[model samples]
Target: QNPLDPDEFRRQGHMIIDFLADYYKNVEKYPVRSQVEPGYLKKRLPESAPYNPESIETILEDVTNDIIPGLTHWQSPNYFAYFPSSGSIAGFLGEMLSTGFNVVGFNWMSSPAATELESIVMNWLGQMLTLPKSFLFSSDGGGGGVLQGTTCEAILCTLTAARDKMLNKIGRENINKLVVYASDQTHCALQKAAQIAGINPKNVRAIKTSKATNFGLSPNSLQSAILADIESGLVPLFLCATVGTTSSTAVDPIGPLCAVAKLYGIWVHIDAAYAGSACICPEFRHFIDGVEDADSFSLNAHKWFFTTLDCCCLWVKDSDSLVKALSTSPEYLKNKQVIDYKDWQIALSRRFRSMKLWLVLRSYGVANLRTFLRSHVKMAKHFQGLIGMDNRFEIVVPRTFAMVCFRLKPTAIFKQKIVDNDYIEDQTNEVNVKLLESVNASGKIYMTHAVVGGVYMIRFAVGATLTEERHVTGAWKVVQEHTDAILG
Candidate 1:
């Protein structure tokens, strides 16, 4: 009833490659964001899977006509949503290899090559970012790495480890008294991880950050919060410091934050998911200056390393801590003084994702990778420059990395004369809100919104593998065109 013929696989694979090549070539022709309303895809698709085998051609045609239209076209040069999942030929081929093998490398005995490859690539990348050797497996300091699906999972594993490590010393009876700290600007993943790790919700500290420090979590503020928490009899458990915050790409000072955590023996986890890819460059390396002191660190290579989705590289200073919290020793799977990755993560089955990282690093090399990241930062600067020359807009925060945060200046637009009342909604945020919706609906470009310090600003992030100079210039023009229409 089933077939695994190599010849059929070859033919179908070639067809799929050709289809994706065309899709990438003309991705810009579609809306950067999908225009279809909710439930549109369900209405078009069958309620159930096909009972019988279908021809490759028939399936391909259906994908083109139905599936293609509903996609957000993230590969489009004009895509400026949340953050780009930059895909490349190297990453694509790597993904294909991973899928083709479909090996669940949960332990060393399960798949030795997969385990070895993962260790080497983690060390390779860790070195590229200049991570201290203590965080490398080669150093024999009980530090090592693993590939998780996303930052949320990585943080959860580390959080649980820190919780158990402390609880072991202080007694599990005090689980309710453990506190976790992160800046108010930190990603929600920290809170999610905290909840999943069973940390009391009230003990999670969202320490306030303001425009004074460009929304970065201040070291003094973090210390003050910790001191108060200690005075209240709560044990400080962990701190999540972020490199590139989601709201405005604000970077929390890792050095000072780590220093604060050290005073209380709190475990530190650095969440550099979106912009961490840029740290491979010497210029960006300073952004993570104190990562060496962190208990655990993670970044989504899938976010910008040209690696496909679901590749989060995480390193811990003490792999033993992770194992103590997450390791299992079932009778069937007890063979890994070698690397049994199941012990490093919450899940039992892990994908052979190192192959993709191997492909990307080997394909691009260090020099070219640095240039690609620098190129995006330059484009981000170019966009920020365009915003500066226009009076109608004000930059919400300083451009850091490849994301621009800008909003319509209510004062500048109002001075031009009374515009359409429909676009105006009494509150300063309303105008910018309508402007974002108008631009995104145009399909010429796509950007997202972020509200910080009570002002709503549109976020223009650039990292799509296919994006070029012309696409960025064209995107700015679209923004201008929409702004003009909104004001009229």
Candidate 2:
């Protein structure tokens, strides 16, 4: 009956840890996704939090039987969904240990060890990835890293910093005249970030990426837009370039993009949320060719770095500007002796989240981590080869790294009917939708869709940490079966 019972907490902790371990070991046995409707899982659970605590054994049973079955198995080898999210044993144990420590890291004084560890690990990570010297505290500036949730927040923070600095330099009244440029292939986060920073949403331009150019953002289109904006008396402030884009893993020519932006003094930020972790391997480093020239760069460790949810790594060339824009200080909260992390981010209170990243990086050395990433890249290439051998399916966008965008071949009648039309746009969408539904219904493999330049296609992201060669082969078999059923 005691509320502060250490025995009960210890029992519950062990139960949950064992449960998670068992789930991970048998993860592939479950379907990639639960075959339940939206309300199915919610309706089965209690309406509100329990007023009384349940027995530890009872709680574990409920979580295993009730909760786990309803959740999508993102860690499964067959999970080729929107983006490959993974959690490894090292990262999982890191989270557990961090929870046990439960220290606040809002500032250095709040927990000196926590803050210093974060700073040290981030610097090590920068060196591991070969990030620019401009974005390092090891250089002559205050440049550094801060954890965030996704690339969305990273893009937003850097864009806001650029916006504020531009306004301060030219005058705050010129804020409304700022314009940003990105390609249509870029993620929606760039525009969303601009809007949140009070930049006029209408001023955000999505330049065209045509098929003839392999869907990359053309340097010519970007220059034309900058000149046009200048003529219209609008200030071009930031240019967001994507590495391994969300839809098809398209690589925007970073060096050329940076060259044009530099000529006009525009700030460049690279979003490599999904492919960034792969840079631990030398062959994949070319994805970020012009990284040294970027004003800022961000990637989500949660997406592919074997870490759990909500760990975004952001590096800035001018960290002081970011601190200047987002920092808040008040009497009783400010201590001259302490290095306050609250000044580095949008939020005041932050978890001891960086510990997980630090632990994962140390436990699995950089070489082991690179091997894990290389395995996924190899599996993705294998999947692409299999898809190519089949005549019924065609690659819509060339496979780059770990994602392949492809669709089922149109029927003879359907193709003939639309042959004369210059734009046979909607037909591909309809066929690909059917392809998705059929493959998903088979309950073997899962994938999502993207509409790039009026072309609708399915994306197979084959890079979960646990994924293997067999899983890719099985997924291909399911696709072939579904194609036969749909066409026959």
Candidate 3:
């Protein structure tokens, strides 16, 4: 089939743009969560491909009538579930331009500008985060960054690089003897990456963390585990420390953990997927202390940087390790420029994700971005204060960044006793579960939950791009209303 006429393309493109603008303007009017059944979309659409091309009008009509209702309005100010996938007008424009060009920048020869621009923007971001000089491309030592599709991919790439390096030093057949470590609260991505890297599942240690430590990974616990592993002849391969954990946003102490890993020559990678964006402000840089000792660090710009989705920045202390583990040079793809990015990741083809990041950074400016981030943090604190006012609820963990974890306390306040504490905790968990279900079912606001220290708590993440004081106050109102209905 031939392409549509240029005039038609322009007309439809303009219409699509306006449609999206209208959606953002009215996003708060829609339900935060999808209200449709699982198979609703499949049953409504045809089973086989259509013989004729449908008019753009017909497609747009279907989108409004069929698709809109089925979607969870992630862009809504009321969407507080999971981490924020913030989007910006500048980021959207960059996405459109990048799609129009459709350049494959696996090597410099394919798209020199794409490769160079990516390099420049990555360094700009590295500096913005105040990363170690060793992680910059301009450093005397060969270190730099690349954009991966997700935190999972970033973890996988670094784990594979570390795995091969260790195998080369030790015997490759001793892979089973290699072990990886992360906090019990670390994202499941670490364990999944270990499995994908061919490390034995049993060898992956999810070290225990205590609530008294704010759920942070203790250096003492980590050191003890490493020594015990060494006694059993298990080699420490990698340590994945989380700067902002997915479950509760618990920040594992970076410096002390790095010191322990350095003793054994174990590679350390920091997965700061969600909260890393906050570090652009001077106030939050402390979260990344000791990151200089890390071999690799990664964060998702899409989460809080007002960048479009699928933008994860991964910086390594040395690019040579990645190249050694992943490089492949066939005659046709070889280039003399020495900046081919196919060697940096698992996949050969990469999207122009850097364009969106660059556009967002420039358009918003560092000052504006900090303001935007600080606004979210302010709202989170406001929400936390509101929760504290309600005696029915109690804070599960100290609020960190823009996420507040809290739970509804049990109605019956019994005297503190060792034997009765477990029973009280169970009742509190059941009440909070019901509260969560009731609140989410209302559809005025949305949130997610996590169980830490055997305590079930609702996670109120306040970082959606459209979120403001009104939305935060409104969400708290919704929670209060639901709590009353649930416990009454």
Candidate 4:
């Protein structure tokens, strides 16, 4: 017998549905983060897993009284932390349906509908978002999509493919000669992925990106490095370009990067994990100007498109190339002649994850999602305006899509205003830290932080699925109040 009874499951399902609905309705009432002390949640949980199952009612009671309170409410409108990692009602329901109908689509025969659905939706998504036509599997050449967890996986896959191509030319035994490039502002994932792929960390160059280029990787700098590497007999293997980068929302110059990479046959992979959702709108499409030239491209709907976790959409210019690096063939797998999705990615047991994206795209449609994305961009700009109006605050980085990085500028007259009357000139970071703490403590609003070019600024990300103009205004008001208190 199954551990959970079917009849009991029905009851539990309804309870869970109602619980989620109630939570959604009253999400604003909860703080983005609980002000609990360290070990608060772990201390309350049982020391060990029970050998014997407990009553459903008892477990539910414990969850309501303890577990729920312990969780950080990522769905809260004020959760401006680490990108928008939350789900919508439709996304949740779709995930539930997919979970119930769990069928691994590792190969075409493993589950036909699952494979077809993933293929169809990915093509539809690529077309709907106006990604390069070459990226669709329907195109004559090798190209396709595979869902992964984060940009990290996508970058890793691309790097592996590039590494394999390099090894094939120079021989796999000389893996240490392969070099990759990403700006200093690039996410740590790029380096981590490189390390995992057997590329020496020292070979992964952290190219210096200047403020004039908005901290984006420079094409000239890339060419100079390529020439230097060639002189040293190091093979220039790959270039990691970012759209709406992690720290300051800096956008690398895609067209020029592609132009330079073309010179050295360097595989270019663009990580638009955060800002890619903005491409659903026309205004932000410029960020992807030279995407057609990229060898692989990846974006996270889960990051900004109101989808739940574990849904990263990765597209490759050459499916065969990606599979060449990732494919595995045990004796059991040799039966299939057709495309086995397991060969296309790093994982063999893949989830029916595309269902949530399909539901979101179908339910909201392209037009509605575009509107949703555009509204968030406007809201972010509105908050940036509010920061500008207050003379005490200075906009640190130019506003990009739904993210605004701003800080309090230290002036000679306001020197005494520094906390603890400290003489440190760079007090913006300290002030913004306190401001975030105070705003979150108020239980009304919350924000996160980012360091751009060694300068700390508060991050106001305005892409919460349910957020609107009023919520953005209210958050700015909270920031204003906190700033006044700090300065006074």
Candidate 5:
């Protein structure tokens, strides 16, 4: 056919929806983690693309038999690994509508509605989170929010902005002397951003964190490092303070850290990819206590907002810094509106992601979203209690907001070998690694692992859209069953 027939599109769309619905209904029946070996899919598929179009039924069959098995099933209620990219019915419908429209909103003239709606929704979200008014588009200050693909892009864009702004003051040739600061517990995105922005790799300072501070970046350590760098004639360019760290959800003291950064005129960017959505609740807002002083802040609504993936909101206290670093002018992209988004990001073409964010925010009102987030926190607390009740397990880094880090106590055999204090941590890590493998192999539930203060522990994050009390209880039961089998 010259073009896809609408009737065929309708039929296939319905079929695809049915396939997804069935998968959701019985998601627990499949392994939460893919069981395939490396290169498994590549070996099974054709070496080259087919010249002729295959029947849709044949394609559906392949998806069922092949694609479904290889997927990690991030939407599964039993998926507790890494972080949850929760998806909702409202988000799915919005994604469908966005796809139908297929607007590439790089400039205001390309799709005015797309550009405006994004600005409006970003302000709405910022207000919902109680962010500083300066970060909102409606403010007298020319600062606003833009949607990027992920926290990586957010960090890179902001870092580049800071880099160029500093280089402009000090000649651009001093780039090698620019140093960026982040805690070792901070996400790796900061280091990657430094590399991409052409800052010297050695200049990326990963200050050490400790258990005494719950793995949070110590303001004193940061200040000392900045002073040392200054004494050595290095320029402090940026500080990437993490609101919720990946391994343990450790929240750095942003207010004080920003104070230290501001002393030397360093740019501060908050990376709140996982736990930022929880800050909508009044109680959790404490995590973002010093955000007003930050130059930029970003979070992934896709992480916990019941929104689809690829919607990361980055707000800047001064949007001009970002534009100065990333903006480009071309004859075809000119617009008088001053709202062209191509200047706000690394990519020229942007998706209509605002549709999904708006749909999720409206479908579940602010109150409903807060309740949803609170439920996840409550479930995590419940899991924490379960871990505490067991003498075999110890909580690592104190449970915080839907993520519990814990590990099985070192085995009795290992306790005997601790005379030199050497191998105790390693022995514990080995046992937990085996336990993780056994639990995942059972296909009942999936959890990831992390190393904190030289201790290996499993991370149980409770933020999946359909996760409930039964799922948490079932997960604990599976953990106990696996532990008994391993320890006995």
Candidate 6:
């Protein structure tokens, strides 16, 4: 009856592992998107928490019958929506170990190994990205990395640091003049970060980007915005350049944009939430080739790195800036050692995320990691080719990494007449919408859509660990069938 009984814990843990294994094995049997209606779970389950302890076996049965029906199977091979939350055996086991230990290693004194392991793993990851030594702790540079919960949190932390640094330099009362810059294609994280960091709403400059450059932010465009802001007596505080945009996976010109930001003494923070994982490969690494001068950078390991959720790695060229902005000093927790992670982040409590990254690196090694990434890219190429074979479809933009943004072509009549064609464009968008809804409702596969450069398109992102070339082919078949259904 003891709550801490090791034997019972071991038994229940084994039961969970077995249950999850079966779930993965039969994952394809369920709909990729949950078919349940709103408020369905509350109708099926008890209104209150169970008053008594339940056997693991009984609970698992209920889970299989009830809980699973409510879940959109993200790990399913058919899931090609958004960015992949790709998970590996190493990631799962590492998470389990981190939870099992459940240590709150906010600072070095509390759990030195946790802190040390994180620093070492961060350095390992930085080297893998071929980042400058100025961004690594082992190189004795003022810069270093930290594991944050997500890109949202990472952006918020960096934005806060930039704000404080600017305020200190330009005087606190000049905060009203601080302006943040990013392309209209950048992620919403910047908007939220600017808001939470107390920048004026009007000061967030969403510089216009054209479809000519595949929606990449232009350096000239950025300079125009900066010049206008400066002329208005507004201070350019920060710039958030994206490596892979959310709409069509568009990558901003990092080198050019960073160069523009520096001329204005603005802090540049590159965000590669989804595509940064691909930069480890030599061919794909050029996307961020000119990132050496950025003040900070971040990427979500949970997105496509074969790691589980909530691991955003943020590297700053000046860790002291973060400490100055977010450090805490209380009587209860005195810091005798120098390295304290809590000061580098917004929150004081941190999970042992280093274990997962460490396990993933050691278990797969750099060679296998590149091979797996290449497989996803290769499958995306295959999908693009299939789309090409069918004249009804058109690739909206160039395929970057594992995501393909495309849509069905409008009628031939509309193609020949390019001017004053808003009507056909609108009609084509509606037709594509029907095609998307048809496929999603079929429950065989799942994908999401995006509107880029005034054109609507479907987004097929392939990074799920279980996804194979067969799945990609099958997905196209489903889309084609749905297209047929709609066209008829």
Task: List, residue by residue over 1-488, the lDDT tens digit for candidate 3.
Answer: 34767787788899999899899999999888999999998999999999988997899999999999998888899999999988999889888888888999898888888888899999999999999989989844388999999999999999999999989988899899999999999998989988888999989999999887899999999999999999998889999999888889999999999999999999999999999989989999999999998899999998988888879999999899998999998987763445889999988998887899889989989999999999999999999999889887888888879999998765434435445478788888888888888888889999999999898899999898988899999999998888777656
Clashing pairs in 1: none
Please give the TM-score that candidate 5 achieves against the real structure.
0.97
Encode model 2's per-residue lDDT on 140-197: one tens digit a residue.
Answer: 4257887876788888888888888888889989888999999988899988888888
User: Global lDDT of each model?
Assistant: 0.89, 0.82, 0.90, 0.82, 0.90, 0.90
Better of 1 and 4 by TM-score: 1
What would the TM-scores of all predictions be? 0.96, 0.94, 0.97, 0.94, 0.97, 0.98
RMSD (CA, Å), candidate 2 to true, equals 2.2
How large is the C-alpha RMSD of every model relative to the true structure? Answer: 2.6, 2.2, 1.6, 2.7, 1.5, 1.4
CA error at residue 302 for candidate 6, angstroms? 0.8
Full-model lDDT, candidate 4: 0.82
lDDT of 4 at 110: 76
Q: Superposing every Cα of model 4 onto the true structure, what RMSD results?
A: 2.7
Candidate 4 per-residue C-alpha lDDT over 258-356 given as tens digits, one digit per residue, 9 for 90 to 100: 999998899999999999878867778888889998888889988888778868999988888988889887988557345678877778888888888
**What are the runs in model 3 whose C-alpha is more than 4 Å off?**
139-141, 335-337, 411-420
Q: What are the per-residue Cα lDDT tens digits for candidate 1 across 1-488? A: 24778887887788888998888878889987888889988898889989977888888888988888888888889998999887888998898899899898998887888999999999999999899888888744278898889999999999999999999998999999999999988999999999988999999999999999899999999999999999999999999999999999999999888988898899999999998889999989999999987888899998989988879999999999999899888987763157788989988998999999999999999999999999989999999999888988988899889999998877755665666353452456888888899998998989999878777788999999899999999999998998888787
TM-score of decoy 3: 0.97
Write down the RMSD of candidate 6 (Cα, Å): 1.4
- The Cα RMSD in angstroms, rounded to one decimal, for candidate 3 relative to the true structure is 1.6
Query: What tens-digit string does per-residue lDDT give for candidate 5 at 280-375?
Result: 999999899899999999999999888888799999999999999998998865634458798999999999989999999899999999999999
Q: What's the true lDDT of residue 339 in model 1?
A: 77
